Amino acid sequence: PVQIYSPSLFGEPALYGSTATIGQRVPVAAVCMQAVGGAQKVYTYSLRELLDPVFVQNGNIIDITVPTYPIYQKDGSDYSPIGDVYAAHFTTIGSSRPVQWTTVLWRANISKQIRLRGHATPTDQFLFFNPQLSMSGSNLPTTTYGLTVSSLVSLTERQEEINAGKWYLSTFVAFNGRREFDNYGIPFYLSLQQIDTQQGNYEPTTEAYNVGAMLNTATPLKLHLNA
Amino acid sequence: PVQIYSPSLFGEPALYGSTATIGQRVPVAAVCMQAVGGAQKVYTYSLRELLDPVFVQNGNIIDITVPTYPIYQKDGSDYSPIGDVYAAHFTTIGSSRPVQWTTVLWRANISKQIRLRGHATPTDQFLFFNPQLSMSGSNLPTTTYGLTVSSLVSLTERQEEINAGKWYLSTFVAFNGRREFDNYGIPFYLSLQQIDTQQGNYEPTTEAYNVGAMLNTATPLKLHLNA
Ligand SMILES: [Ca+2]
């Protein structure tokens, strides 16, 4: 595996999860990941710049760009490649109400405006594990994580800028979803039902740190290379 | 300036702030930072182990051990050294209600049980910038940070184990406090008043990520060397 880190931009949002499919509905415009040699697809609105990443393997800084699979945009009925994925990692978060989180590291190969827009009927929800300060009695606090699920919305049309050569994170998450496909052993999940916006706390996992689903201090990303 | 990152242990709490002083009251047992050329001191119960840290300076992994100042424990009236500080950084988060935050990287020089015990009268409060998913209408969410302040408590006696050779983070924070002293340029602030548990949101800063006051994705700590 590759350990990944980078300074964040001023006010740059943290990684999060989005869903945009209910029944047969799909978003009008979104970031798409289709399986190699397959027609299956998942969607996302997650697009996070890595301002200046650093890649580390087995304690040594390496150059990832010295077997990739592309990442597309869906723009209406028109899919188009926007970059290539170098590493990805998946993990199941939770027990009786699992959240499947797939993070992919990719480098844009075109400097373009990426349109995001949900289906006209509200279908778009967003997921985040918000770190909380937990106190039981008069002891040292710990960090718990709650699952924040936004209410259903129809994502207003918007333009997001990507630049050739830059690195980007993109999650593909699902709430109690199905195994749609996998790419080089990394599964990709999809859920098709509205998510109850009332959710409890989720026990932390060391893989949720690796995929970036739960924030922690000085904790780098850690994904599998395409192999 | 050194970038630091590390994988977190299973469920390891994220960096938080602690205050333990009101008026002339000081904790019974806590981690102490003394001015290199003075008798001034600040206190904390923050003590977070870095499982397997990596230090990066100007793009390259470095061995930071090849001018340090000690970090002590206060145990009753007794003070004793427990480690040596290799890097530190300071920043203020907020305008009308500022929070002074100093993070110090240090390596333990003894393996023993460190005593934490607040004053008998409640004096201990803890502070955390909890990352939140905020949504304005039907648009992409952002990450805001609220200021979680625990209620006044008297920290129950406890023992925290440290091991010589391991790396530990420790914060020294204040809520609209005074600059007690500085160690190799990095100021250390102290607050001597109970903190109102009702607080608002704090706008992001790049320094908050570097010192680790606000969590972000794949974002390392970045502290100054001792010079
Ligand atoms: Ca002693």
CSV table of C-alpha atoms and ligand atoms in Angstrom, one decimal:
chain,number,residue,atom,x,y,z
A,1,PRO,CA,0.0,0.0,0.0
A,2,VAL,CA,0.8,3.7,-0.5
A,3,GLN,CA,0.6,6.2,2.3
A,4,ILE,CA,-0.8,9.5,1.0
A,5,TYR,CA,-0.8,12.9,2.6
A,6,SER,CA,-1.1,16.6,1.5
A,7,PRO,CA,-1.6,20.0,3.0
A,8,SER,CA,-5.2,21.2,2.6
A,9,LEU,CA,-6.2,24.5,1.0
A,10,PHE,CA,-7.7,27.3,3.1
A,11,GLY,CA,-11.2,26.2,3.8
A,12,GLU,CA,-10.9,23.1,1.7
A,13,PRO,CA,-13.7,20.6,2.7
A,14,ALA,CA,-12.9,17.2,4.2
A,15,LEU,CA,-13.6,14.0,2.4
A,16,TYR,CA,-17.3,13.0,2.4
A,17,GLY,CA,-19.8,10.6,0.9
A,18,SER,CA,-22.5,11.4,-1.6
A,19,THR,CA,-25.3,9.4,-3.1
A,20,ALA,CA,-27.4,10.3,-6.2
A,21,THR,CA,-29.4,7.3,-7.2
A,22,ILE,CA,-32.9,6.1,-6.1
A,23,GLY,CA,-34.8,3.5,-8.0
A,24,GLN,CA,-33.9,4.0,-11.7
A,25,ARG,CA,-33.0,7.6,-11.2
A,26,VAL,CA,-29.4,8.7,-11.8
A,27,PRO,CA,-27.9,12.2,-11.6
A,28,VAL,CA,-28.0,14.5,-14.6
A,29,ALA,CA,-24.3,15.3,-14.3
A,30,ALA,CA,-21.8,13.8,-11.9
A,31,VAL,CA,-18.4,12.1,-11.6
A,32,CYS,CA,-18.6,8.5,-12.8
A,33,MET,CA,-16.6,5.3,-12.3
A,34,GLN,CA,-17.3,2.5,-14.7
A,35,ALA,CA,-15.9,-1.0,-14.2
A,36,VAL,CA,-13.1,-2.1,-16.6
A,37,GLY,CA,-14.6,-4.5,-19.1
A,38,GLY,CA,-18.0,-3.8,-17.7
A,39,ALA,CA,-21.1,-1.6,-18.1
A,40,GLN,CA,-21.8,-1.1,-14.4
A,41,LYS,CA,-21.4,2.4,-13.0
A,42,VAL,CA,-21.4,4.3,-9.7
A,43,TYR,CA,-21.7,8.1,-9.3
A,44,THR,CA,-20.4,10.8,-7.0
A,45,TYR,CA,-20.2,14.5,-6.4
A,46,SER,CA,-17.0,14.2,-4.4
A,47,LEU,CA,-14.1,16.1,-5.9
A,48,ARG,CA,-11.3,17.1,-3.6
A,49,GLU,CA,-8.1,18.8,-4.7
A,50,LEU,CA,-4.8,17.4,-3.3
A,51,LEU,CA,-2.9,20.7,-3.3
A,52,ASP,CA,0.6,19.1,-3.1
A,53,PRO,CA,0.5,15.3,-2.3
A,54,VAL,CA,3.3,13.1,-1.2
A,55,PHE,CA,3.3,9.4,-1.8
A,56,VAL,CA,5.1,6.9,0.6
A,57,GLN,CA,5.6,3.2,0.2
A,58,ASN,CA,7.3,1.0,2.9
A,59,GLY,CA,8.8,4.1,4.5
A,60,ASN,CA,10.2,5.6,1.3
A,61,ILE,CA,8.8,8.5,-0.8
A,62,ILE,CA,8.0,7.2,-4.3
A,63,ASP,CA,6.7,8.5,-7.6
A,64,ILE,CA,3.4,6.8,-8.4
A,65,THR,CA,3.7,7.7,-12.1
A,66,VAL,CA,6.8,5.6,-12.9
A,67,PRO,CA,-1.7,-0.3,-14.8
A,68,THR,CA,-4.3,2.5,-14.4
A,69,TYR,CA,-8.0,2.7,-15.1
A,70,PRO,CA,-9.8,6.0,-16.0
A,71,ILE,CA,-12.5,8.0,-14.2
A,72,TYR,CA,-15.3,9.6,-16.2
A,73,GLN,CA,-17.8,12.4,-15.9
A,74,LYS,CA,-21.4,11.8,-16.8
A,75,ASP,CA,-22.8,15.0,-18.4
A,76,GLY,CA,-26.4,14.3,-19.4
A,77,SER,CA,-26.2,11.3,-21.6
A,78,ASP,CA,-22.6,12.0,-22.5
A,79,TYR,CA,-19.8,10.2,-20.5
A,80,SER,CA,-16.3,11.4,-21.0
A,81,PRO,CA,-12.9,10.5,-19.4
A,82,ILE,CA,-11.4,13.1,-17.1
A,83,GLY,CA,-8.5,11.3,-15.5
A,84,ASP,CA,-6.8,8.1,-14.5
A,85,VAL,CA,-7.0,6.3,-11.2
A,86,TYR,CA,-3.7,5.1,-9.6
A,87,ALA,CA,-4.9,3.7,-6.2
A,88,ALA,CA,-8.1,2.9,-4.4
A,89,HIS,CA,-9.3,1.3,-1.2
A,90,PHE,CA,-12.7,0.2,0.2
A,91,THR,CA,-14.0,-0.7,3.6
A,92,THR,CA,-17.3,-1.5,5.3
A,93,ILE,CA,-18.1,0.9,8.2
A,94,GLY,CA,-20.7,-0.2,10.7
A,95,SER,CA,-22.5,-3.4,11.6
A,96,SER,CA,-26.3,-3.6,11.4
A,97,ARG,CA,-26.4,-0.4,9.2
A,98,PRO,CA,-23.2,-0.6,7.2
A,99,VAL,CA,-21.8,2.2,5.1
A,100,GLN,CA,-19.6,1.1,2.2
A,101,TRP,CA,-16.8,3.6,1.5
A,102,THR,CA,-14.6,3.5,-1.6
A,103,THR,CA,-11.9,6.2,-2.0
A,104,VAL,CA,-10.0,6.5,-5.3
A,105,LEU,CA,-6.8,8.5,-6.0
A,106,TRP,CA,-6.7,9.9,-9.6
A,107,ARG,CA,-4.9,12.4,-11.7
A,108,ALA,CA,-6.8,14.6,-14.1
A,109,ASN,CA,-5.7,14.5,-17.7
A,110,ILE,CA,-7.8,17.5,-18.9
A,111,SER,CA,-8.3,21.0,-17.6
A,112,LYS,CA,-12.1,21.4,-17.9
A,113,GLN,CA,-15.2,22.5,-16.0
A,114,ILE,CA,-17.0,19.5,-14.6
A,115,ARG,CA,-20.8,20.0,-14.4
A,116,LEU,CA,-22.6,18.6,-11.4
A,117,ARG,CA,-26.4,18.4,-11.3
A,118,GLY,CA,-28.7,16.0,-9.7
A,119,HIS,CA,-31.9,14.5,-11.1
A,120,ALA,CA,-34.8,16.9,-11.1
A,121,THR,CA,-36.6,14.9,-8.5
A,122,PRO,CA,-34.6,15.2,-5.2
A,123,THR,CA,-32.3,12.2,-5.1
A,124,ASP,CA,-29.0,13.6,-3.7
A,125,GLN,CA,-27.8,13.0,-0.2
A,126,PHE,CA,-24.4,13.5,1.5
A,127,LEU,CA,-22.7,11.4,4.2
A,128,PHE,CA,-20.1,12.5,6.7
A,129,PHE,CA,-18.7,10.9,9.9
A,130,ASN,CA,-18.3,13.9,12.1
A,131,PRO,CA,-15.7,13.5,14.8
A,132,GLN,CA,-17.2,14.3,18.2
A,133,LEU,CA,-15.6,15.0,21.6
A,134,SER,CA,-17.0,12.3,23.9
A,135,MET,CA,-16.9,12.5,27.7
A,136,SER,CA,-18.1,9.8,30.1
A,137,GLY,CA,-18.0,11.2,33.6
A,138,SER,CA,-15.0,13.2,34.7
A,139,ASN,CA,-12.3,11.4,32.7
A,140,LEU,CA,-10.2,12.2,29.6
A,141,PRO,CA,-12.4,12.7,26.5
A,142,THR,CA,-12.3,10.4,23.5
A,143,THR,CA,-13.3,11.0,19.8
A,144,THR,CA,-16.5,9.4,18.7
A,145,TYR,CA,-17.9,9.6,15.1
A,146,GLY,CA,-21.6,10.2,14.2
A,147,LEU,CA,-23.1,9.6,10.8
A,148,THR,CA,-24.4,12.9,9.4
A,149,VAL,CA,-26.9,12.3,6.5
A,150,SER,CA,-28.2,15.3,4.7
A,151,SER,CA,-31.8,15.5,3.7
A,152,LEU,CA,-32.9,14.8,0.1
A,153,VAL,CA,-32.1,17.6,-2.3
A,154,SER,CA,-31.9,18.1,-6.0
A,155,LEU,CA,-28.3,19.4,-6.4
A,156,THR,CA,-28.4,22.7,-8.2
A,157,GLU,CA,-26.3,22.9,-11.4
A,158,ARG,CA,-22.7,24.0,-10.8
A,159,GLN,CA,-19.3,24.0,-12.4
A,160,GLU,CA,-16.2,22.4,-10.7
A,161,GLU,CA,-12.8,23.1,-12.1
A,162,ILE,CA,-10.2,20.4,-12.6
A,163,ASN,CA,-6.7,20.8,-14.0
A,164,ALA,CA,-4.6,18.3,-16.0
A,165,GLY,CA,-1.7,17.0,-13.8
A,166,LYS,CA,-3.4,17.7,-10.5
A,167,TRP,CA,-4.3,14.9,-8.1
A,168,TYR,CA,-7.9,14.4,-6.8
A,169,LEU,CA,-9.7,12.3,-4.2
A,170,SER,CA,-13.2,10.9,-5.1
A,171,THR,CA,-15.3,8.8,-2.8
A,172,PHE,CA,-18.0,6.3,-4.0
A,173,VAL,CA,-20.1,5.4,-1.0
A,174,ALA,CA,-23.4,3.6,-0.4
A,175,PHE,CA,-25.7,3.2,2.6
A,176,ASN,CA,-26.5,-0.5,2.9
A,177,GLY,CA,-25.9,-0.9,-0.8
A,178,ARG,CA,-25.0,-3.6,-3.3
A,179,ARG,CA,-21.7,-4.8,-4.8
A,180,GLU,CA,-22.0,-3.2,-8.2
A,181,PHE,CA,-18.5,-4.1,-9.5
A,182,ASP,CA,-14.9,-4.1,-8.6
A,183,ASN,CA,-11.8,-2.7,-10.2
A,184,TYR,CA,-8.5,-4.5,-9.5
A,185,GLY,CA,-10.0,-6.1,-6.5
A,186,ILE,CA,-11.4,-2.9,-5.0
A,187,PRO,CA,-15.2,-3.2,-4.7
A,188,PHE,CA,-17.6,-0.4,-5.6
A,189,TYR,CA,-20.9,-0.2,-3.8
A,190,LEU,CA,-24.2,1.5,-4.8
A,191,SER,CA,-27.4,2.2,-2.8
A,192,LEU,CA,-30.7,3.0,-4.4
A,193,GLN,CA,-33.0,4.1,-1.4
A,194,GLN,CA,-33.4,7.3,0.5
A,195,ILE,CA,-31.2,7.3,3.7
A,196,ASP,CA,-32.8,8.0,7.1
A,197,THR,CA,-31.2,11.3,8.2
A,198,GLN,CA,-31.4,10.0,11.8
A,199,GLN,CA,-28.2,7.9,12.4
A,200,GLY,CA,-26.3,6.9,15.5
A,201,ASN,CA,-22.6,6.8,16.3
A,202,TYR,CA,-20.2,4.5,14.4
A,203,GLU,CA,-17.3,2.6,16.1
A,204,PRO,CA,-13.9,3.5,14.5
A,205,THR,CA,-12.0,1.1,12.3
A,206,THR,CA,-8.4,1.4,11.2
A,207,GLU,CA,-9.5,0.9,7.6
A,208,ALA,CA,-11.9,3.9,7.9
A,209,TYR,CA,-8.8,5.9,8.7
A,210,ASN,CA,-7.0,4.4,5.6
A,211,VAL,CA,-9.9,5.3,3.2
A,212,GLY,CA,-10.4,8.7,4.8
A,213,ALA,CA,-13.9,8.0,6.0
A,214,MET,CA,-13.1,9.1,9.6
A,215,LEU,CA,-10.8,12.0,10.3
A,216,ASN,CA,-7.9,11.6,12.7
A,217,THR,CA,-4.8,13.6,13.7
A,218,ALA,CA,-1.9,13.5,11.3
A,219,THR,CA,-3.4,10.4,9.8
A,220,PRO,CA,-2.4,9.9,6.1
A,221,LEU,CA,-4.5,8.1,3.5
A,222,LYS,CA,-3.6,4.5,2.6
A,223,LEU,CA,-4.9,2.8,-0.5
A,224,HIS,CA,-3.9,-0.2,-2.7
A,225,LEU,CA,-2.0,0.3,-5.9
A,226,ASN,CA,-3.6,-1.2,-9.0
A,227,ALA,CA,-2.3,-4.7,-9.0
B,1,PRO,CA,9.5,23.3,8.9
B,2,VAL,CA,8.8,19.5,9.2
B,3,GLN,CA,5.7,17.7,8.0
B,4,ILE,CA,4.6,15.0,10.4
B,5,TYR,CA,2.1,12.1,9.8
B,6,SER,CA,1.4,8.8,11.4
B,7,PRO,CA,-1.2,6.0,11.3
B,8,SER,CA,-3.6,6.2,14.2
B,9,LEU,CA,-4.1,3.3,16.6
B,10,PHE,CA,-7.5,1.6,16.7
B,11,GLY,CA,-9.9,4.2,18.0
B,12,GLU,CA,-7.1,6.6,19.0
B,13,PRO,CA,-8.6,10.0,20.1
B,14,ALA,CA,-7.9,13.0,17.9
B,15,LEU,CA,-5.9,15.9,19.2
B,16,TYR,CA,-7.9,18.0,21.7
B,17,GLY,CA,-7.3,21.0,24.0
B,18,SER,CA,-7.3,21.0,27.8
B,19,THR,CA,-7.3,23.8,30.4
B,20,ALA,CA,-6.7,23.1,34.1
B,21,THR,CA,-6.1,26.5,35.7
B,22,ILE,CA,-8.5,29.0,37.2
B,23,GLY,CA,-7.2,31.8,39.5
B,24,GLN,CA,-4.4,30.3,41.6
B,25,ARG,CA,-5.6,26.8,41.1
B,26,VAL,CA,-3.3,24.4,39.1
B,27,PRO,CA,-3.9,20.6,38.5
B,28,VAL,CA,-2.7,18.1,41.0
B,29,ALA,CA,-1.0,16.1,38.3
B,30,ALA,CA,-0.5,17.0,34.6
B,31,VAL,CA,1.9,17.3,31.8
B,32,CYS,CA,4.0,20.5,32.3
B,33,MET,CA,5.9,22.7,29.9
B,34,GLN,CA,8.4,25.1,31.6
B,35,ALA,CA,10.1,28.1,30.0
B,36,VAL,CA,13.7,27.3,29.0
B,37,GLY,CA,14.9,30.4,30.8
B,38,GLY,CA,12.2,31.1,33.3
B,39,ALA,CA,9.9,29.7,36.0
B,40,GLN,CA,6.7,30.1,34.0
B,41,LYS,CA,4.7,27.0,33.2
B,42,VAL,CA,1.6,25.7,31.4
B,43,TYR,CA,-0.3,22.5,31.9
B,44,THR,CA,-2.2,19.9,29.9
B,45,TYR,CA,-3.6,16.4,29.9
B,46,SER,CA,-3.2,16.0,26.2
B,47,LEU,CA,-0.8,13.1,25.5
B,48,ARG,CA,-1.4,11.3,22.1
B,49,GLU,CA,1.1,8.6,20.9
B,50,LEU,CA,2.2,8.7,17.3
B,51,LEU,CA,2.3,4.9,16.5
B,52,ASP,CA,4.8,5.1,13.6
B,53,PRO,CA,5.5,8.8,12.6
B,54,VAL,CA,7.2,10.0,9.5
B,55,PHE,CA,9.0,13.3,9.3
B,56,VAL,CA,9.3,15.2,6.0
B,57,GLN,CA,11.3,18.3,5.5
B,58,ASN,CA,11.3,20.2,2.1
B,59,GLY,CA,10.1,17.0,0.3
B,60,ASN,CA,12.3,14.4,1.9
B,61,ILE,CA,12.0,12.0,4.9
B,62,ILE,CA,14.5,12.9,7.6
B,63,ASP,CA,15.8,11.5,10.9
B,64,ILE,CA,14.9,14.4,13.2
B,65,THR,CA,17.1,13.1,16.0
B,66,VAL,CA,20.4,13.3,14.1
B,67,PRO,CA,18.8,21.6,20.5
B,68,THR,CA,15.9,20.1,22.5
B,69,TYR,CA,13.9,21.3,25.5
B,70,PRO,CA,12.4,19.0,28.1
B,71,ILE,CA,8.8,18.3,28.8
B,72,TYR,CA,7.8,17.4,32.4
B,73,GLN,CA,5.1,15.9,34.5
B,74,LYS,CA,3.7,17.7,37.5
B,75,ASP,CA,2.9,15.2,40.2
B,76,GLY,CA,1.7,16.9,43.4
B,77,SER,CA,4.4,19.5,44.2
B,78,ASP,CA,6.9,17.4,42.3
B,79,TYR,CA,8.0,18.0,38.7
B,80,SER,CA,10.0,15.5,36.7
B,81,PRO,CA,11.2,15.3,33.1
B,82,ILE,CA,9.5,12.7,30.9
B,83,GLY,CA,10.8,13.6,27.4
B,84,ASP,CA,12.4,16.1,25.0
B,85,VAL,CA,10.7,18.4,22.5
B,86,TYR,CA,11.9,18.4,18.9
B,87,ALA,CA,9.4,20.7,17.2
B,88,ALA,CA,6.5,23.0,18.1
B,89,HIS,CA,4.1,25.4,16.4
B,90,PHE,CA,1.6,28.0,17.6
B,91,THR,CA,-1.5,29.7,16.2
B,92,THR,CA,-4.6,31.6,17.3
B,93,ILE,CA,-8.0,30.5,16.0
B,94,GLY,CA,-10.8,33.1,16.2
B,95,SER,CA,-11.2,36.8,16.4
B,96,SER,CA,-13.7,38.0,19.0
B,97,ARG,CA,-13.2,34.8,21.1
B,98,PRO,CA,-9.7,33.6,20.2
B,99,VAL,CA,-8.2,30.2,21.1
B,100,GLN,CA,-4.5,30.0,21.5
B,101,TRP,CA,-3.2,26.6,20.4
B,102,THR,CA,0.4,25.2,20.8
B,103,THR,CA,1.3,21.7,19.7
B,104,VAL,CA,4.6,20.2,20.6
B,105,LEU,CA,6.2,17.0,19.3
B,106,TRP,CA,8.4,15.3,21.9
B,107,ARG,CA,10.0,11.9,22.5
B,108,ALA,CA,9.7,10.2,25.8
B,109,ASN,CA,13.0,9.5,27.7
B,110,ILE,CA,11.5,7.2,30.3
B,111,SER,CA,9.0,4.3,30.5
B,112,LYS,CA,6.6,4.9,33.4
B,113,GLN,CA,3.0,5.8,34.4
B,114,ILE,CA,2.3,9.5,34.2
B,115,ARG,CA,-0.2,10.8,36.8
B,116,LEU,CA,-3.1,12.9,35.7
B,117,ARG,CA,-5.4,14.4,38.4
B,118,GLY,CA,-7.2,17.7,38.4
B,119,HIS,CA,-7.6,20.0,41.4
B,120,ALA,CA,-10.2,18.9,43.9
B,121,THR,CA,-12.3,21.9,43.0
B,122,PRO,CA,-13.6,21.6,39.4
B,123,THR,CA,-11.1,23.4,37.2
B,124,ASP,CA,-10.7,21.1,34.1
B,125,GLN,CA,-12.2,21.8,30.7
B,126,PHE,CA,-11.6,20.3,27.3
B,127,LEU,CA,-11.8,21.9,23.9
B,128,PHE,CA,-12.3,20.4,20.4
B,129,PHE,CA,-12.9,21.8,17.0
B,130,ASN,CA,-15.4,19.2,15.9
B,131,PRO,CA,-15.6,19.0,12.0
B,132,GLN,CA,-19.2,19.4,10.8
B,133,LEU,CA,-20.9,18.8,7.4
B,134,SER,CA,-22.6,22.1,6.6
B,135,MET,CA,-25.1,22.5,3.8
B,136,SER,CA,-26.5,25.8,2.4
B,137,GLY,CA,-29.6,24.8,0.5
B,138,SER,CA,-29.3,22.3,-2.4
B,139,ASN,CA,-25.6,22.7,-3.0
B,140,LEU,CA,-22.4,20.8,-2.3
B,141,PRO,CA,-21.6,20.7,1.5
B,142,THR,CA,-18.6,22.2,3.1
B,143,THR,CA,-16.8,21.5,6.4
B,144,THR,CA,-17.3,23.9,9.3
B,145,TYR,CA,-15.8,23.6,12.7
B,146,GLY,CA,-17.6,24.2,16.0
B,147,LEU,CA,-15.9,24.8,19.3
B,148,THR,CA,-16.9,22.0,21.7
B,149,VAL,CA,-16.1,23.0,25.3
B,150,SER,CA,-16.7,20.4,28.0
B,151,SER,CA,-18.4,21.4,31.3
B,152,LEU,CA,-16.3,22.1,34.4
B,153,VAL,CA,-15.1,18.9,36.0
B,154,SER,CA,-12.5,17.7,38.5
B,155,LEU,CA,-10.4,15.2,36.5
B,156,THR,CA,-10.5,11.9,38.3
B,157,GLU,CA,-7.0,10.4,39.1
B,158,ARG,CA,-5.6,8.2,36.4
B,159,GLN,CA,-2.3,6.8,35.0
B,160,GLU,CA,-1.2,7.3,31.4
B,161,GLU,CA,1.6,5.0,30.2
B,162,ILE,CA,4.4,6.4,28.1
B,163,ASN,CA,7.4,4.5,26.7
B,164,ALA,CA,10.9,5.8,26.2
B,165,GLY,CA,11.7,6.3,22.5
B,166,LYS,CA,8.1,6.8,21.3
B,167,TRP,CA,6.8,10.1,19.9
B,168,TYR,CA,4.0,12.0,21.5
B,169,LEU,CA,2.0,15.0,20.6
B,170,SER,CA,0.8,17.4,23.4
B,171,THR,CA,-1.3,20.5,23.1
B,172,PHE,CA,-1.1,23.6,25.3
B,173,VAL,CA,-4.2,25.7,24.7
B,174,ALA,CA,-5.9,28.8,26.2
B,175,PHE,CA,-9.2,30.6,25.7
B,176,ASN,CA,-8.4,34.3,25.4
B,177,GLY,CA,-5.4,33.9,27.7
B,178,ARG,CA,-2.0,35.5,28.3
B,179,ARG,CA,1.3,34.6,26.7
B,180,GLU,CA,3.1,32.9,29.6
B,181,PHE,CA,6.4,32.4,27.8
B,182,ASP,CA,8.0,31.1,24.6
B,183,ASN,CA,10.4,28.3,23.9
B,184,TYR,CA,12.7,28.9,20.9
B,185,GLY,CA,10.2,31.4,19.5
B,186,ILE,CA,7.0,29.4,20.0
B,187,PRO,CA,4.7,31.1,22.5
B,188,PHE,CA,2.7,29.2,25.1
B,189,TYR,CA,-0.6,30.7,26.4
B,190,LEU,CA,-2.5,30.1,29.6
B,191,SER,CA,-6.2,30.7,30.5
B,192,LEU,CA,-7.3,31.3,34.1
B,193,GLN,CA,-11.1,31.5,33.8
B,194,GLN,CA,-13.9,29.0,33.3
B,195,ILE,CA,-14.9,28.7,29.7
B,196,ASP,CA,-18.5,29.3,28.6
B,197,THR,CA,-19.7,25.9,27.2
B,198,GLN,CA,-21.8,27.8,24.7
B,199,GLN,CA,-19.7,28.6,21.6
B,200,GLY,CA,-20.1,29.1,17.9
B,201,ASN,CA,-18.3,28.2,14.7
B,202,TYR,CA,-14.6,29.1,13.9
B,203,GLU,CA,-13.5,29.8,10.3
B,204,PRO,CA,-10.8,27.5,8.9
B,205,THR,CA,-7.1,28.5,8.7
B,206,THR,CA,-4.1,26.8,7.2
B,207,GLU,CA,-2.3,27.1,10.5
B,208,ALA,CA,-5.1,25.3,12.3
B,209,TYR,CA,-4.4,22.3,10.1
B,210,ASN,CA,-0.6,22.5,10.7
B,211,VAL,CA,-0.8,22.7,14.5
B,212,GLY,CA,-3.7,20.2,14.3
B,213,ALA,CA,-6.4,22.3,15.9
B,214,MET,CA,-8.8,21.4,13.1
B,215,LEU,CA,-8.8,18.1,11.3
B,216,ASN,CA,-8.8,17.7,7.6
B,217,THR,CA,-8.3,15.0,5.1
B,218,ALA,CA,-4.9,13.5,4.5
B,219,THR,CA,-3.5,16.6,6.1
B,220,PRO,CA,-0.2,16.3,8.1
B,221,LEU,CA,1.0,18.3,11.0
B,222,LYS,CA,3.6,20.9,10.2
B,223,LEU,CA,5.7,22.3,13.0
B,224,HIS,CA,8.9,24.4,13.3
B,225,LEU,CA,12.2,23.0,14.5
B,226,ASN,CA,13.9,24.4,17.6
B,227,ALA,CA,15.8,27.5,16.4
C,1,CA,CA,10.9,13.9,40.8
